[PDB]
Amino acid sequence: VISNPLSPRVIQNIIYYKCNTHDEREAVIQQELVIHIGWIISNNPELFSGMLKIRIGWIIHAMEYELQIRGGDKPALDLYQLSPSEVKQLLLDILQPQQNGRCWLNRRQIDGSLNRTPTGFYDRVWQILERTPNGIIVAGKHLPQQPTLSDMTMYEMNFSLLVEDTLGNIDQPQYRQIVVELLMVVSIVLERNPELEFQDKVDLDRLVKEAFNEFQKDQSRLKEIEKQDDMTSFYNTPPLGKRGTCSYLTKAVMNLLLEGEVKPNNDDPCLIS
Amino acid sequence: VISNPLSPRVIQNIIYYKCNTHDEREAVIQQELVIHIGWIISNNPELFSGMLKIRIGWIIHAMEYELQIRGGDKPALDLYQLSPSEVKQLLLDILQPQQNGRCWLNRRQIDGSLNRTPTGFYDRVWQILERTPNGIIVAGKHLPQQPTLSDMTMYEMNFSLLVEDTLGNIDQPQYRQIVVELLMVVSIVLERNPELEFQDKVDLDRLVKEAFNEFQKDQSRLKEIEKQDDMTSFYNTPPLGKRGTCSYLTKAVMNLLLEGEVKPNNDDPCLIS
Numbered sequence A, B: 001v002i003s004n005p006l007s008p009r010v011i012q013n014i015i016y017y018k019c020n021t022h023d024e025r026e027a028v029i030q031q032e033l034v035i036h037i038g039w040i041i042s043n044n045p046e047l048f049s050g051m052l053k054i055r056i057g058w059i060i061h062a063m064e065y066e067l068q069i070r071g072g073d074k075p076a077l078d079l080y081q082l083s084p085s086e087v088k089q090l091l092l093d094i095l096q097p098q099q100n101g102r103c104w105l106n107r108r109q110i111d112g113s114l115n116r117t118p119t120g121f122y123d124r125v126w127q128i129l130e131r132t133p134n135g136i137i138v139a140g141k142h143l144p145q146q147p148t149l150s151d152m153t154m155y156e157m158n159f160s161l162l163v164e165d166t167l168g169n170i171d172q173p174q175y176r177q178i179v180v181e182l183l184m185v186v187s188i189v190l191e192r193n194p195e196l197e198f199q200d201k202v203d204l205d206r207l208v209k210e211a212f213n214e215f216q217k218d219q220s221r222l223k224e225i226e227k228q229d230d231m232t233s234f235y236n237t238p239p240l241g242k243r244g245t246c247s248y249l250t251k252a253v254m255n256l257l258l259e260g261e262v263k264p265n266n267d268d269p270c271l272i273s
């Protein structure tokens, strides 16, 4: 993670020795994307908004996948054979605001791989941590309420990096988009409903597994798909729609929240105590 | 139902011939409560707020129950042996705002029997009918969206009477308090969450049965109570608390609402969508 300005010779060890030890063709492509992304950050800064940690390896992954989705049955072209400029247009195309059209499996793989976050994701994760006593555990990482709530403020950039570190261990990029969506749903449930508050630690993976398992069960009732622990169907389901991904997650979060005390709140005092 | 001013001689048929044909000792006690309630309405009008249809037979029932809860193991005194004034103090005591202390089975039996409604119950039932296309069915009655939405306005007194007629067939008074609570919960879920809207008719009895069955299952996991279809435990559970009645009902309503389209809403357009 180059978090601070570094020398050409330190940056070179990071690319040819410290990070890429399996394929060095990756270091040339990653060097190609830093040059392309750097001018894109300078002249078109907003093609990279909602991105705070630009994972060049993950952005290259989004590009290899875009070549496969674009490719169709015909074999996908090798990003490596593509010309420096063709690699820049692939990047510019993947960075383009995902529009109505692509499979929601492709939208998720690109957004998750680019690590794009809905606006206010970081502020919304603060609001989830403020109303959760024991913290959020995602992919074996844990944002505990303290020392973060005590040492940080809502819009602190340091927090955005802690949220990004917490979601660091999410290996699969489409899972990062579902975890980013559970967190966006948990923020709407918590904000829309001010009475509910988490008792134990929120395991974002378990809320996602529970949502997929409900989807698995409901889709099974439609047509009994026999693929198991394959979330491809779940990822393709649109976020909002008749039975979309956002329903399953809201349900899971609400079952967890409702298993705990409902604090009587004064903003809209109950008409029933 | 005496909805309009009537003569002493018409009121007399209503009490000794038309309504009480099984025990006429009931007509003397009901006559006793109209005299007591009538001065209470005149001088202390708010001991009867949240009450629009004063069911004297149901209010006498609340009083016979208060004598049993007050009685303890020792046999409950016969309301009929009680002196006219002792019957007025029993009434004044049952009408007193239920305070923190009594079993939530007793709070419910008194409130349900007095037909007390949380403030704005009637306005909140309009809001449930406005966002439910095919209406609410309770105890074999149905508040359909039309002709009521078309012919009535939110604060119309005519609507309060239609809501009270719909909840008319609820024989058991504690069930009326749970149905009044499901309706209060459905109003908080619908209001807090503006995107969710009911697809089919809301059967308030089915939402209550599904909440009791979840409670039955969870309490069974604690201690396996063998009483079946006995809602006494559910009624005693406090409305809001660690696992209270309001959680089960919110859950049931949310499962029904989330089984339908989530209308994308513009007040807080989706950030992750």
Ligand SMILES: C/C=C(\C)CC/C=C(\C)CCC=C(C)C
Pocket (backbone or CB within 6 Å): A184, A185, A188, A189, A190, A191, A192, A193, A246, A247, A250, B189, B192, B193, B195, B196, B262, B268, B269, B270, B271, B272, B273
């Ligand atoms: C962009 C995402 C949303 C607009 C959230 C959709 C809302 C729900 C699935 C129900 C939320 C319910 C609560 C009680 C908070």
Ligand SMILES: C/C=C(\C)CC/C=C(\C)CCC=C(C)C
Pocket (backbone or CB within 6 Å): A189, A192, A193, A195, A196, A262, A269, A270, A271, A272, A273, B184, B185, B188, B189, B190, B191, B192, B193, B246, B247, B250
């Ligand atoms: C007097 C009653 C209440 C204060 C309602 C309690 C709230 C819930 C049980 C959760 C509601 C959730 C929504 C998304 C509307």
